[PDB]
């Protein structure tokens, strides 16, 4: 009731779990050019001045706790400039026992994995308007875009939307803090399992060809488009292969 916790986690799903795309569609639209610069070349007083603006202009303005978002440029990527960006969140003492540094980097691990897929299909969809006024590269773009759109819909409406709805109900039947601490870290170690975060490093290389493909089309050749097809389709038949050998993790193939 006082210093509420359930009305305090929904202020995290709005930013970390990317439940509101009205703040992102407006933030990357501002800080795109100033993130492609390499690291140790961008001024952090500029990004915070862009984050602080992207909120109040969007629909995230109606939030009591919006003043707790800080930029934190991590040193190592999801094992530069753009692949080293992630929010940071600060809380007071009484609410810190629940959401601590041990259980906040996990919120910060499964965010970058969803900012990376959100970044590529934001540009891979951007090359679509450049070609709209040589004719065999479209049938490959259809194969790539329909794969990242099929990962995100699996990662939002299948893993992080159902598991969160459990936690909301699983906190009304709690009896003590030693249980709320069990239903929270019991929600994070489940998301990082149904997601590919825990190995499946071929996903990282598979997204590598997609960003390169957008780059090639950004310079506007006839012999390299067919190379990407043989390269990208080879990695996808590897992803669908390992995702089949399991005892969810089997419903992904139907996605």
């Amino acid at each position: 009731e006082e210093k509420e916790l359930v009305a305090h986690l929904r202020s995290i799903k709005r930013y970390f779990l990317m439940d509101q795309g009205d703040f992102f569609v407006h933030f990357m639209d501002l800080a795109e050019e100033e993130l492609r610069k390499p690291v140790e070349d961008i001024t952090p007083p500029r990004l915070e001045a862009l984050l602080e603006l992207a909120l109040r202009m969007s629909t995230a303005n109606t939030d009591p706790f919006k003043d707790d978002l800080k930029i934190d440029l991590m040193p190592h990527d999801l094992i530069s400039g753009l692949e080293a960006f992630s929010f940071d969140y600060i809380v007071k003492w009484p609410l810190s026992l629940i959401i601590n540094r041990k259980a906040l980097t996990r919120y910060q691990m499964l965010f970058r994995h969803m900012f990376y897929c959100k970044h590529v299909e934001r540009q891979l969809c951007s090359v679509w308007i450049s070609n709209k006024t040589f004719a065999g590269a479209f049938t490959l773009r259809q194969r790539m875009l329909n794969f990242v759109q099929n990962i995100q819909y699996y990662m939002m409406f299948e893993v992080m939307e159902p598991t969160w709805h459990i936690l909301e109900k699983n906190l009304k039947s709690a009896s003590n803090i030693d249980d709320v601490l069990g239903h929270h870290t019991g929600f994070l170690d489940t998301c990082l399992k149904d997601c590919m975060l825990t190995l499946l490093k071929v996903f990282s290389k598979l997204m590598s060809v997609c960003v390169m493909f957008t780059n090639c089309m950004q310079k506007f050749f006839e012999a390299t488009i067919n190379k990407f097809d043989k390269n990208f389709s080879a990695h996808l038949l590897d992803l669908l292969a390992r995702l089949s050998i399991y005892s969810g993790m089997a419903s992904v193939i139907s996605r």
């Binding site: 990317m18 509101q20 795309g21 009205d22 969809c125 995100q152």
Partner: peptide, 17 residues
């Protein structure tokens, strides 16, 4: 009504054309 996916018209068009 903003949600998670398909938060823009261009997203609509790309998914069809």
């Amino acid at each position: 009504y903003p949600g998670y996916m398909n938060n823009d018209l261009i997203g609509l068009i790309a998914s069809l054309i």
